[PDB]
A paper describes a structure:
The α and β subunits form one heterodimer (αβ) and the α and γ subunits form another heterodimer (αγ), which are assembled into a heterotetramer (α2βγ) and further into a heterooctamer (the heterotetramer and heterooctamer are sometimes called holoenzyme).
To investigate the structural basis for the functional roles of these residues in the allosteric regulation, we took the γ-K151A mutation as a representative and determined the crystal structure of the αγK151A mutant bound with Mg2+, CIT and ADP at the allosteric site. In addition, accompanying with the conformational changes of Arg97G and Tyr135G, the N-terminal part of the β5G–β6G loop and the N-terminal region of the α7G helix at the heterodimer interface also undergo similar conformational changes as in the αMgγMg+CIT+ADP structure. However, the C-terminal part of the β5G–β6G loop and the β7G strand assume similar conformations as in the αMgγ structure. Due to the γ-K151A mutation, the hydrogen-bonding interactions of Lys151G with Asp190G and Tyr237G are lost but the hydrogen bond between the main-chain amine of Leu138G and the main-chain carbonyl of Leu150G is maintained. As a result, the β7G strand has no conformational change, and consequently the β7A strand, the β5A–β6A loop and the N-terminal region of the α7A helix also have no conformational changes and adopt similar conformations as in the αMgγ structure.
Numbering used by the authors:
A (entry chain A): 4 to 45, 51 to 75, 81 to 318, 320 to 338
B (entry chain B): 15 to 349
Write the structure that this text describes.
């Protein structure tokens, strides 16, 4: 048995955390929780939440409200340097893209996060942004490590080095050095705009996408858009000292933050991702498959995907989980 | 008779230019092409010479010049030097669902107006401390105002009802905030046009789910690059969509996605539709509207027939066979 720092967050976050916990309970998963709270206090994160995460080394996180952002603090505190978003078409959930199985791996310390804007003269704004050899090397090595450890054949570096020669070219040169080492993984490179162009025509051609943060997270949202949105998209951040936080990337949902209408799929799958990161592959697969089969049925869905409430959807998963 | 500069470019550009000339002869288009070549050269005297040709003729049709990104940062994109030197400030593309080309979405009709000069395209990079590349990018009121001005005017003149500014002012509060405030400034003078705004991240998710919501979109340079390719992808890909680059006085026409097509060059499989439609936009701009119309109808009629399709849209036809069909359709309305 092992311990996981749980951050339910605001809005629907509690409802969906209780729904995830109940499912992990009904799975006999080697996982007990250590619920904590997160809050900017004078500027850093609470002593109890920091120490919890330092001990447990693994976190799960629901949707937070913006006030310094808490996501900024978490990323700063634990040096969360690699954002990972796996996007896979859901059998029961109908989008026009069904062949989708892509993992985006995104540098998470610099680029736009280093961003300074200022007024040069009246009506002229300059932005300043940074790209480092270190952080580029770091995210590159990670991406291949991820691909090897998750049985992924191809890694594509996504860039605009044709325009940003110095900064995306650096990124590219560090990806090649890593690709020289890890000759077992198929490596290619593609312009961001070409990636985008091809993505929406035939997304099946793409496997793992490594990219810097210079232009932000735009491609991850696009990929998520193909499979049905942020309401069903899992996500995880990997830091230094073996820290890893898994999270939902959907909104706080204030409008139904008291009701039973919520949908915990995304947070559930991030937890599934967490189990796999620990090595608990058996339970991961069973909770995963339970969720997908429940979605495939069509008679038990939330109001955002039928008419059934959250607990009905949560309970119908739990019923299927128990089938060992 | 008009004289038009022609830059064949790399990849599929030269082979498609031949078909353009061929189609103009069959349509009896009163246009003469003055060819200027632009290598991706270490030298610049060519690009300086090509700029002169465009200042002279005021109108050009061009293929895409390939940028070797393995060259040092002193060697810059010749496409970008070309468009910024001439101050061709408005990149505009029209993505419209084609009845004959079936994709995952239909009823798409989007005009994208993209600021074509500043942002990361005119940025400065330096490595003052080893292993740290710093990027300094500029966005300005003057350029944001005129792109918004262009987009609203175009919307009004085309009988369109809504302009959506795409941006990331949630993150880039000063720069993208200024861009957005410039659009709103112009919006107040077009009270007949609905004005909306949307974050670029969210915009991509909306396009792959419900792209029918968008009408006219206006944005700075980088988001334009992304949105152009997404929208072009949704309607059938890079083979189909024409692109224009407008200045106050000069105008240059190209394929919307600005692809060289090196991998498919010299195999008689390139889709000629984007290039021909670009040549039609160019004829409209020269007030040769009857010619543009005949040709545009011809290419739209051929694409209505899946037997004419090239491999990029699932077909098996050659470039020359598609051209044959276009020429056949000109001749039918021709006499
Ligand atoms: N006219 C066309 N017909 C068919 N395919 C095209 C056409 N133009 C571009 N493509 C395809 O779209 C992609 C464009 O990428 P690419 O040729 O590498 O351009 P660039 O080097 O400017 O990024 C290629 O797959 C190319 O084959
Ligand atoms: Mg190009």
């Amino acid at each position: 048995v092992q311990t996981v720092t749980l951050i339910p967050g605001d809005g629907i976050g509690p409802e969906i955390s209780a729904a995830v916990m109940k499912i992990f309970d009904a799975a006999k998963a080697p996982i007990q929780w250590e619920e904590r709270n997160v809050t900017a206090i004078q500027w850093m994160i609470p002593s109890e939440a920091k120490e919890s995460m330092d001990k447990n080394k693994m976190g799960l996180k629901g949707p937070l409200k913006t006030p310094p952002s808490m996501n900024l603090l978490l990323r700063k505190t634990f040096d969360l340097y690699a954002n990972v978003r796996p996007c896979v078409s859901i059998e029961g959930y109908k989008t026009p893209y069904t062949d989708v199985n892509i993992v985006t791996i995104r540098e998470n310390t610099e680029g736009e996060y280093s961003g300074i804007e200022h007024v040069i003269v009246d009506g002229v704004v300059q932005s300043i942004k940074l790209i480092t050899e270190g952080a580029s090397k770091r995210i590159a090595e990670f991406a291949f490590e991820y691909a090897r450890n998750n049985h992924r054949s191809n890694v594509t570096a996504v860039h605009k080095a044709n325009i940003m020669r110095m900064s995306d070219g650096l990124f590219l040169q560090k990806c090649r050095e890593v690709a020289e080492s890890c000759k077992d993984i198929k490596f290619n490179e593609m312009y961001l705009d070409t990636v985008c162009l091809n993505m929406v025509q035939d997304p099946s051609q793409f496997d793992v996408l490594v990219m810097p943060n210079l232009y932000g997270d735009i491609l991850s949202d696009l990929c998520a858009g193909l499979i049905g949105g942020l309401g069903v998209t899992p996500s995880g951040n990997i830091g230094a000292n073996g820290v890893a936080i898994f999270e939902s990337v959907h909104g706080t949902a204030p409008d139904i933050a008291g009701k039973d209408m919520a949908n915990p799929t995304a947070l559930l799958l991030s937890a599934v991702m967490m189990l796999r990161h620990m090595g608990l592959f058996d339970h991961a697969a069973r909770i995963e498959a339970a969720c997908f089969a429940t979605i495939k049925d069509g008679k038990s869905l939330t109001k955002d995907l039928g008419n059934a409430k959250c607990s009905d959807f949560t309970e119908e998963i739990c019923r299927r989980v128990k089938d060992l | 008779r008009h004289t038009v500069t022609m830059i064949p470019g790399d990849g599929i550009g030269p082979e498609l230019m031949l078909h353009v000339k061929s189609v103009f002869r069959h349509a009896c288009v009163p246009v003469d092409f003055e060819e200027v070549h632009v290598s991706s050269n270490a030298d610049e005297e060519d690009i300086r010479n090509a700029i002169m040709a465009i200042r002279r003729n005021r109108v050009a049709l061009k293929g895409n010049i390939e940028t070797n990104h393995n060259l040092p940062p002193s060697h810059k994109s010749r496409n970008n030097i070309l468009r910024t030197s001439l101050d061709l400030y408005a990149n505009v593309i029209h993505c419209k669902s084609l009845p004959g080309v079936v994709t995952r979405h239909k009823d798409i009709d989007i005009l994208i107006v993209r600021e074509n000069t500043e942002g990361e395209y005119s940025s400065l990079e330096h490595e003052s401390v080893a292993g740290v590349v710093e990027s300094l990018a500029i966005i300005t009121k003057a350029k944001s105002l005129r792109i918004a001005e262009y987009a609203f005017k175009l919307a009004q003149e085309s009988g369109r009802k809504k302009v959506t500014a795409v941006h990331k002012a949630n993150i880039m509060k000063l720069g993208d905030g200024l861009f957005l405030q410039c659009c709103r400034e112009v919006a107040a003078r077009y009270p007949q046009i609905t004005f909306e705004n949307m974050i670029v991240d969210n915009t991509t998710m909306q396009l792959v789910s419900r792209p029918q919501q968008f009408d006219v979109m206006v944005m700075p340079n980088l988001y334009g690059n992304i949105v152009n390719n997404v929208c072009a992808g949704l309607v059938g890909g890079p083979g189909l969509v024409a692109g224009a680059n407008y200045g106050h006085v000069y105008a240059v026409f190209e394929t919307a996605t600005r692809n060289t097509g090196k991998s498919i060059a010299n195999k008689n499989i390139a889709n000629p539709t984007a290039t021909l439609l670009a040549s039609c936009m160019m004829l409209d701009h020269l007030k040769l509207h009857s010619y543009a119309t005949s040709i545009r109808k011809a290419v739209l009629a051929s694409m209505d027939n899946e037997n004419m399709h090239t491999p990029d849209i699932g077909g098996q036809g050659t470039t020359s066979e598609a051209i044959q069909d276009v020429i056949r359709h000109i001749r039918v309305i021709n006499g």
